[PDB]
Every structure is written in structure tokens, then in C-alpha cells.
Motif scaffolding. Structure first.
Motif, short mmCIF file in Angstrom:
data_model
loop_
_atom_site.label_atom_id
_atom_site.label_comp_id
_atom_site.label_asym_id
_atom_site.label_seq_id
_atom_site.Cartn_x
_atom_site.Cartn_y
_atom_site.Cartn_z
N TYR A 140 22.24 30.95 39.52
CA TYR A 140 23.08 31.80 40.12
C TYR A 140 23.33 31.17 41.49
O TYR A 140 24.54 30.99 42.21
N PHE A 145 29.28 31.08 43.72
CA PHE A 145 30.08 32.41 43.60
C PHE A 145 29.52 33.02 42.53
O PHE A 145 28.61 32.72 41.97
N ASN A 146 29.87 34.40 42.59
CA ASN A 146 29.50 35.36 41.74
C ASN A 146 30.74 35.68 40.85
O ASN A 146 31.68 35.94 41.09
N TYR A 147 30.48 35.37 39.43
CA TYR A 147 31.36 35.88 38.17
C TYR A 147 31.65 37.52 38.46
O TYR A 147 30.86 38.22 38.80
N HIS A 157 25.62 38.91 39.42
CA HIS A 157 25.99 38.89 38.02
C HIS A 157 25.42 37.93 37.05
O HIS A 157 26.48 36.85 36.65
N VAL A 160 26.27 36.37 32.76
CA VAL A 160 27.23 35.41 32.15
C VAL A 160 26.65 34.11 31.93
O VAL A 160 26.99 33.43 31.00
N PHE A 161 25.40 33.69 32.52
CA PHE A 161 24.61 32.59 32.15
C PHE A 161 23.78 32.51 31.13
O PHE A 161 23.46 31.50 30.58
CL LIG Z 1 27.56 35.42 38.62
#
Ligand SMILES: [Cl-]
Ligand SMILES: [Cl-]
Ligand SMILES: [Cl-]
Length: 837
Positions: A140, A145-147, A157, A160-161
Motif C-alpha cells: 500500500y 493512492f488508495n483504491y 484499503h 484489493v492487494f
Molecule cells: Cl488501497
């Protein structure tokens, strides 16, 4: 079967918080959270304000270990495989000093050759589970950026990874419990010569006269030598051989690809629920070397065709299912995980859930993409209950990464699960994701991210959902439909799009639309729509104290996860019902409200066949005690909605629909046969049981197979006064030529709040035996939307949430293994009039 030996590694496990040196007994398959709960190291995660109190676990690493004995004879077998059906998620697996695997995908089963690392006597298996949070924090940090994954309940978040059940990080119906562990079985298989790595029964063609099959085997031969073998496939039904085929080969070291044709003449087709029997053949493949069967694998197989028809037409683009060449209007629901802790879901729970689907006349279930690819048992039950399965891949609500490593993890899970599931009769189609294109188009990420980041998101979408996943389905499940997203085009804010493919029409609930909008806002196929309810009191009591009995109390809000909350239920209730003063009464009317409103939409969908060709409501079930869109709460209690779905999905339905002060009556049939010379009989009955006017009879009606047709229309003006409209109902009956009733309905001409309901005392007689309570209910006057409430969790009713008609006795059978003879089941009968003065 075969000569292999299977050792289940399901006992003897211990776990430890990394860094503590303290080992305690564990249960495998299981979860870190359940293991902690079992030692009273966490509180009940589902109670009150406890969700905040259990979050610490996700920040720690967790270790598991077990030891097992291997004999000299076992050690001398040709091959020995260690199989992990599921590791959640970042798990370093060590056996006897060897790192066997660095696992990184909850959705992949891992088969590991281990003969060279096992030892005679004691063997030690240790698994180190990296926190999926700590594992991905540097990832992250590198991302910049943050999804926009609103459903991931953390500032960062991280979900998602990781290829890990999306809902474990939270959801709009779900608690956050980011767990870890050995979540599916671990087995050691000792065997000779070879194993069958894959057995796929491909259906080449199917007609009434013949089924042509291709038996495709992948055989992994583990010995240095070339081995003569005979491959056999036996096809049987009910224990009797239908056809048998064989093929001589010489197995080479490593992978062998073997194909054997077979045919079944005059095949018995698998039919979905409501259309006949879900007949399953037994296909067994065997590898015989000399006199011994060294490997065998079977599948239950259903001989049917399923075609998804998704074509441009005069109305936009159709979206429907053809089963055995016949268009089948889809009736069912969206399924989510049955628990926050997956291994806690028992075989009995899966069986009961399928009984709930079958008994509600469902023929389809969507396995929605924020959950898991389900266990084998789920698909087996869908096979034997005639329920088609729409299978999302496990991506939901957010755009995801699309870098090479990430796409490699995804390819691995897609191959594994497509091969795992593709022999199931019930499996009907694959869907790339839930709502991701909708998010990318309609949440204005154009202005929440830089143009470069947003373009990366859009390109990444294509790489995963328009390239990788459909290519994988084409390679491994070429006969099954794939669509990149649900809904693929239609958006609930864009009426012009509704004629094109499937809809998630969230005007009701999210758009605050009245339930009547479902009559006008029609889709080609409704793959989601929904409305929430508080679960009944015995479930509320499981997560809340009486002090918390207010719809916006801290505890009730802690058990609401939607972007619009509990107050919206009161807002809708006020439109149609008098709002009760007491919390318990509110909860009761709220169940009634959700059932009535949603049934209206299910009816609209069926009534508008063939424009509309299916309805799957959001949602079937719950993962924990919560306020949600479910029809069955976490403890297995049917809400009113589940009975209402059962009714609305009945193969033959009389559907009176009143709009603009006029009544229309539709006859709706999903039967395969046409019904001839039918009579619709209707009469107005006041709340005291007195008929008003004459019976109305419509004779010589045809109800063709698989149609919805209007058979009667009448203006209310000149037929009923506004006063009769508030104090009478319409009784409708459909009978055949000889007078036998095939369907009945009841219609109310005004909103429930506008009805002049009489006070009435509902009496009952009870006959109680072991496992069973028989109730006969009676009221001289209408009792509206009766709820028979019992404190016994999961109690099942032949019926509940129905109108008790004046002077018409009603028998209800309540069942539960916990009902005891001579231990009187408490019974509380609620009805609408009792909720106000
Ligand atoms: Cl994220
Ligand atoms: Cl091996
Ligand atoms: Cl080969």
C-alpha cells in the motif's frame, strides 16, 4: 475406489500468537478467531459493541503446528501428496525442515509432492500465517493512492492487494473479521503409480436420443518407469451400469492426457427445480495397472443444456437462460458467505439453506463476488436440488490492481476453481465481478484520482475482466457463458439503460423509491434488488440488550452496515403502516413491510415476462446477526420475505395488480404444460367474513406453459365504494374444469395503514409431540399479516406471515429437533391491528 490411503490431518493441531511462545489446542479446518474464542481469548464477536474489540487479531501473525506418524510401509508407497484445500492467506508451510510452499491465495488448493521429505515415525508440519494487514502495508505504501473500496472497513484499503475473501475486511451487510488459518481440509495421500489430477466430463452434444460425452483425464505418473494401464470409465444410474468404456495406454513419467468417448442413449435429463427431477449420473474413471486400481475419481453428472441468451433485440439486449431448449424464467436470490468464520459453517447448515431455496420454489442462486468460491458441498447440493448457479469471480465493488504478479495470482485461482467446479450440473455461467464497471463509470473517479491513475484503473479493468478471466473460461469451460460484470450496462439511475442486459435496480432502498416503482421500472433480468429488515426478536436478543432497543441506538447502528441506515426502514414503514410505539412491534411490522414490498417486485418481474426473464433478490442470507436485506436471518429463521418469495415464486400464481384505481388479474405459470378450461373465481369479503355483492366468475381460461397473461380487468369506480375498499378484501381462486383449486390469492384495495382492521383475538389449539408442534388457528375477523413467534431458534413453520381470513381455520406445523413432548412451546401471535390503538 482405489488402492490409495488418505490420512486426514484434522486433529492434533496447536496455534500460537507469533512472538509469545505459548501454544494452545486448535481446530482444523478453522480460523484464528474461532481458536481464540474457544479459549475465551476473544469475546463473542457478534454481540453488542464487540466488533471494535476483536480487531487486534488482524495485526498479529499466527502460527499453527501438528505432528503425525508415517510408517515404513506408507513411506514405501510410490507417491505421497500433501493437499491443502485452503490456506487463508499468506502462509509459509514447513514440513521436517523444508519450506514446501509460500501460499498467497485463499482461493487456491495446493497439491504438494512430499515423499522425499517425509520421515519414518514423527513428522512435523508448521505453518506461519503472516498478517494480511502487515503483509500488505508496504505494498500500500508503494502504491501512491488508495483504491476506492468503501466496503473495506479500514482507513487503508488493503483488501484489493490480497486474493482473500473480500467480505472478511467488512461489507455493507458484514462485520470486519480479517481472519487467517487452515480454512479447508488438509490431507496426505499415499498411493501407487499415479493420481488423476483432473477428470472432466465434457458434453459434446445432447438430444432426446443420445448424449455424447468426452471423458478427459489428466494423470500424473510419479514413477521412473513406463507403466501399461487400462483406463476405464463406468457410467451408472442408481447403482446400475448404463455404459462402460475402456482404453489401453502406457503411462509415461509425468503428465498424461487421456480422452475416452462415451455415449448414453435415451438420456434422462437433469431438470431444474419446478420442472422435474434433477437426475444425476455417476461417472467413475479408474486407472488399472495389472490387477490393481491405482487411482479412481468420480463425478455426479447431469445431462442438460444451459444456454444464456444475451442478444440485441427490439427492446435492447435480452438476458435469459434456456434450459434443455426451454426458456426458463429465473427465480432466486443472491447468496453471501454463511458466516464471518467460514469453517464454522456446518454440513447441516448448507443442507438447510438448500432446503430453504428449494422450498421457496427457487431455480437459481447467484454466488456473489465479495464472498468465496464455495465449497464442493454447496455445488453438490445445487446439483441435487435443481438450482442453477451464477458464479461471480471473487471481485466486488472496487477496481483492483492489474500488475503482472497480481494477474498471475488471479490466473491461478481462475484455473483452479474453473477445473474444480466445471463438472457440476448446476453451474450455469461465470461473471467477472460485481458492480466494478458501474463503480468506474458512475462514482466520479474522474475527479477522485489523477487522470493517469484513473486511466490505469480503466486499462486494468480490461486486462482482468475483458482479457484474463474470459480467456480462462474459454480455455477451461468453453461451453459456459461469461460476462465481464453484473450489471454489465444497465444502471439504476439511467432509465434508458434498463432494456439492456441485467439490472441491479437499487431505486428501492438506495434511491428511496416506493415499492410501486417496481411495477414501472422494469428490467430484462433483475440480478439485484432489495430491502432491509431488522431480524426477529430472538435474533436481536442474541446481539443486543433491552436498553439497546431503539432503531438508532449505538448497538443497532453497530449492526447496520449500509450507507443508509435503520431510519430508512421507519421512513418506508410510515408510507404503508401505522408506526408502532414499541420496538418489538416495530420489528414485527418491519418484517411484514420487507416481505410485502419485495413480493410486489417479484410479482412485477414475473408478470412482465417475457420482457423480464428473471429476478434474483438481494439477499438470501446473513453472515452474522445484523440488520440487512436477507430473507433468512443468521440463525436460520425465515423472515416474512422468505415466505413471500415462496408464494411469489409458486409455479402457478394468480397476480391481481391494482394501479390508477383499476384492478387487473394476471395468471402466471412456469409449468411446462398448458392448463385448459380453467375458471377464475373472485369475491369481495368484508373483515367479518361476509361476502359483498356476487361472486365473479371467469370461465374457459387457458394458462399456457411459461406465460403471464391478463384475464380480467375492472375499474373500482362503480364496483366498490371507498368505504368498502378499506374494509374488504378480494378472495381469488383458480380451479380446473372439475372444480379442483390450483392457486389462490388475496388482494387488498388500500394500504395497510388505511385499512379499518377490527380488533380480534386469535385463538389456537396446540398438539405437541417430539420434534413437532401442530397449531390450529382461528379468528372470526380478519387478522392481518399474522406472525406466529416462538423463542426457539431456527424453528421451521409450514407457513407464517399470512393473513388469517375471517372464520377460516388455519393449520400450522412448527418443527424443530428441540421441540419435546410435554414441554409446551411458547407461542406469541402478532397481527397488525394489535400494534396500535
Ligand atoms: Cl488501497
Ligand atoms: Cl511424492
Ligand atoms: Cl500424454
Amino acid at each position: 475406489n482405489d488402492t490409495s490411503e488418505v490420512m486426514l490431518l484434522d486433529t492434533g493441531w496447536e496455534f500460537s500468537q507469533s512472538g509469545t511462545e505459548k501454544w494452545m489446542p486448535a481446530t482444523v479446518p478453522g480460523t484464528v478467531h474461532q481458536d481464540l474464542i474457544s479459549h475465551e481469548l476473544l469475546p463473542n464477536p457478534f454481540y453488542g459493541m464487540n466488533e471494535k474489540k476483536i480487531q487486534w487479531v488482524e495485526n498479529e501473525d499466527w502460527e499453527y503446528r501438528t505432528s503425525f506418524i508415517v510408517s515404513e510401509e506408507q513411506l514405501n508407497r510410490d507417491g505421497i501428496q500433501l493437499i491443502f484445500e485452503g490456506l487463508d492467506t499468506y502462509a509459509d508451510v514447513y514440513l521436517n525442515g523444508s519450506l514446501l510452499l509460500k501460499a498467497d491465495n485463499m482461493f487456491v488448493g495446493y497439491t504438494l509432492p512430499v515423499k522425499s521429505v517425509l520421515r519414518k515415525g514423527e513428522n512435523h508440519l508448521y505453518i506461519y500465517f503472516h498478517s494480511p494487514i502487515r503483509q500488505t502495508l508496504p505494498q500500500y505504501a508503494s502504491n501512491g493512492f488508495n483504491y476506492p473500496a468503501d466496503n473495506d472497513h479500514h482507513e487503508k484499503h488493503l483488501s484489493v492487494f490480497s486474493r482473500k475473501a473480500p467480505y472478511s475486511y467488512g461489507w455493507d451487510w458484514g462485520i470486519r473479521m480479517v481472519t487467517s488459518g487452515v480454512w479447508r481440509p488438509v490431507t496426505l495421500r499415499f498411493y501407487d503409480i499415479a493420481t488423476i489430477s483432473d477428470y472432466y466430463v465434457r458434453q459434446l452434444s445432447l438430444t432426446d436420443e443420445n448424449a455424447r460425452l468426452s471423458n478427459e483425464l489428466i494423470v500424473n505418473q510419479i514413477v521412473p518407469q513406463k507403466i501399461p494401464a487400462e483406463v476405464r470409465v463406468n457410467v451408472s444410474l442408481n447403482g446400475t451400469t448404463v455404459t462402460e468404456v475402456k482404453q489401453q495406454v502406457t503411462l509415461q513419467p509425468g503428465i498424461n492426457h487421456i480422452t475416452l468417448p462415451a455415449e448414453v442413449t435415451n438420456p434422462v435429463r437433469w431438470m431444474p427445480n419446478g420442472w422435474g427431477t434433477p437426475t444425476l449420473y455417476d461417472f467413475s474413471a479408474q486407472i488399472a495397472c495389472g490387477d490393481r486400481i491405482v487411482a479412481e475419481q468420480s463425478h455426479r453428472i447431469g445431462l442438460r443444456t444451459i444456454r444464456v441468451v444475451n442478444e440485441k433485440d427490439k427492446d435492447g439486449e435480452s438476458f435469459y437462460f434456456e434450459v434443455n431448449g426451454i426458456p426458463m424464467f429465473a427465480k432466486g436470490a443472491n447468496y453471501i458467505p454463511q458466516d464471518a468464520l467460514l469453517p464454522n459453517v456446518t454440513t447441516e447448515r448448507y443442507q438447510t439453506l438448500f432446503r430453504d431455496m428449494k422450498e421457496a420454489n427457487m431455480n437459481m442462486v447467484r454466488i456473489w463476488g465479495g464472498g468465496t468460491y464455495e465449497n464442493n458441498l454447496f455445488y453438490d447440493l445445487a446439483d441435487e436440488n435443481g438450482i442453477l448457479v451464477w458464479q461471480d469471480f471473487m471481485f466486488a465493488c472496487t477496481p483492483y490492481p492489474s500488475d503482472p504478479t497480481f494477474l498471475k495470482r488471479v490466473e491461478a485461482e481462475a484455473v483452479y476453481n474453473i477445473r474444480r467446479l466445471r463438472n457440476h450440473a448446476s453451474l450455469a455461467m461465470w461473471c467477472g465481478n460485481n458492480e466494478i464497471l458501474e463503480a468506474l463509470k458512475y462514482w466520479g473517479f474522474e475527479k477522485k484520482f489523477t487522470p493517469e491513475v484513473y486511466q490505469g484503473l480503466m486499462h486494468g479493468y480490461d486486462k482482468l475482466f475483458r482479457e484474463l478471466l474470459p480467456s480462462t473460461v474459454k480455455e477451461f469451460d468453453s461451453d459456459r457463458f461469461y460476462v465481464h460484470s453484473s450489471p454489465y450496462l444497465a444502471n439504476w439511475g439511467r432509465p434508458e439503460s434498463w432494456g439492456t442486459g441485467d439490472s441491479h435496480n437499487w431505486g428501492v432502498w438506495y434511491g428511496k423509491k416506493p415499492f410501486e416503482s417496481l411495477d414501472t421500472d422494469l428490467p430484462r433480468f433483475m440480478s439485484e434488488f432489495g430491502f432491509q429488515s431488522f431480524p426477529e426478536m430472538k435474533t436481536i436478543a442474541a446481539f443486543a440488550a433491552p436498553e439497546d432497543y431503539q432503531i438508532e441506538s449505538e448497538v443497532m447502528n453497530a449492526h447496520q452496515k449500509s450507507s443508509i441506515g435503520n431510519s430508512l426502514i421507519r421512513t418506508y414503514m410510515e408510507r404503508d403502516y401505522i408506526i408502532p410505539e414499541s420496538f418489538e412491534d416495530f420489528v414485527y411490522v418491519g418484517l411484514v413491510l420487507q416481505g410485502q414490498g419485495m413480493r410486489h417486485g417479484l410479482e412485477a418481474h414475473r408478470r412482465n415476462r417475457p420482457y423480464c426473464m428473471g429476478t434474483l433478490y438481494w439477499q438470501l442470507n446473513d453472515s452474522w446477526p445484523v440488520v440487512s436485506w436477507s430473507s433468512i436471518d443468521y440463525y436460520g429463521n425465515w423472515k416474512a420475505l422468505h415466505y413471500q418469495a415462496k408464494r411469489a415464486f409458486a409455479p402457478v400464481l394468480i397476480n391481481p395488480i391494482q394501479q390508477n384505481d383499476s384492478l387487473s388479474v394476471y395468471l402466471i405459470s412456469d409449468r411446462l404444460d398448458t392448463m385448459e378450461q380453467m375458471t377464475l373465481e373472485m369475491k369481495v369479503v368484508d373483515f367479518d367474513g361476509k361476502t359483498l355483492g356476487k361472486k365473479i366468475q371467469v370461465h374457459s381460461l387457458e394458462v399456457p406453459a411459461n406465460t403471464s397473461k391478463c384475464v380480467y380487468r375492472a375499474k373500482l369506480d362503480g364496483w366498490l365504494t371507498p368505504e368498502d375498499c378499506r374494509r374488504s378484501f378480494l378472495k381469488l381462486i383458480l380451479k380446473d374444469k372439475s372444480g379442483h383449486q390450483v392457486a389462490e390469492s388475496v388482494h387488498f384495495f388500500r394500504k395497510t395503514k388505511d385499512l379499518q382492521l377490527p380488533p380480534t383475538s386469535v385463538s389456537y389449539q396446540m398438539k405437541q409431540t417430539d420434534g413437532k408442534c401442530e397449531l390450529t388457528l382461528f379468528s372470526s375477523m380478519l387478522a392481518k399479516d399474522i406472525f406466529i413467534e416462538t423463542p426457539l431458534q431456527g424453528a421451521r413453520y409450514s407457513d407464517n406471515f399470512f393473513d388469517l381470513l375471517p372464520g377460516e381455520r388455519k393449520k400450522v406445523i412448527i418443527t424443530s429437533p428441540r421441540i419435546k413432548k410435554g414441554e409446551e412451546l411458547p407461542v406469541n401471535i402478532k397481527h397488525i391491528r394489535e400494534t396500535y390503538k
